[PDB]
Amino acid sequence: GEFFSSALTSAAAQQKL
Amino acid sequence: LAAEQEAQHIVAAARNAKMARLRQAKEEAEREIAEHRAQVER
């Protein structure tokens, strides 16, 4: 839950998944 | 993300496109049979 925002940012930056 | 969002729309619309295309194809196909029947009736 804490790292959900960071994961969303990382998915947006790096990138049926 | 872009990957998650993009795939959903086309996959969702694929079934509707297939259904519409099948219905249309049957629509003009039945026209040929109707025309043959009309020629036979004449």
Partner: protein, 46 residues
């Protein structure tokens, strides 16, 4: 990259849709050929 693979999967779904549409068109042509055969059948009967 990942978005490309997701779009490829979506395009595969769309290609399945298009193949289904083509198969349905062929099936409709066969069905109306059968309908013409039936029409000729009861027409010759009449």
């Amino acid at each position: 990259m990942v978005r490309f693979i997701r779009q490829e999967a979506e395009e595969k779904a769309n290609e399945i849709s298009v193949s289904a549409e083509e198969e349905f068109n062929i099936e409709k042509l066969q069905l109306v050929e059968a309908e013409k055969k039936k029409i000729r059948q009861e027409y010759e009967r009449k």
